Amino acid sequence: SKTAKIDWSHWTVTVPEENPDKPGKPYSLGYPEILNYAEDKIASKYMYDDPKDKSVVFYAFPSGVTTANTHYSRSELRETMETGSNKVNWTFAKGGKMRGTYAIDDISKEPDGKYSRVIIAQIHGVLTDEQRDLIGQKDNNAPPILKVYWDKGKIRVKTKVLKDLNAPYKEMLSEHAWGGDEGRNFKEKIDLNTRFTLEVKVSDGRMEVILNDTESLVYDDIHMKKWGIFENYFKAGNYFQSKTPGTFAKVKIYSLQVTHL
């Protein structure tokens, strides 16, 4: 209404600041406490309203506080397709769609004078407990099959590839079986302080990323078929890709919608 169009019943947030009651781990909020973000003494520093334009600002910077499988600091949402739970997630065959309206509100430069980079949307894989236990892994982590960056004035997309197409199932379940692709950039340059839309559409063996409802980048080869073994969740916000002292980003979200029809 007066605030950004985000359905808080389907997201958790993790921020850059340490949780005082859980040392070494970043503070997080899930439902229903996330609804209190604006009055949360910790979270409101990093996820807060701009009432002038009805956005939510995600502010992140190197804090030295991260999670076990996350390299950099973040102020970022994690999708919970079932309100209140983290273990209900979706396969590519079930599918999903995420639509967001963003702006890169402010960002630092690196020492070479080029802007720092920020990840604003992801699809993260997740192992089921049965898969985790089959391969004897300590947690349910799996690769980020999709990462969408703002990178030096372009929207850049990175996906994962299976390094050995003959890899057996138990090997394919490990992150070491997957590596990064070469990356693809949208043609339309996206300036700072400029609203733009992203749409991510996932279906069986297929992922499509759409910028400003014009250009699509489509992924629909063997790697997307092989990725079908995982469950997934969306992420959105500010996963800030620098540890250089003094760097930061602020990402605004005006609208964010996920569906699994």
UniProtKB/TrEMBL annotation:
Highest taxon of source: Bacteria
Q: Does the keyword Lyase apply?
A: yes
* Alphabetized UniProt keyword annotations: Lyase
Q: This protein is called what?
A: Alginate lyase
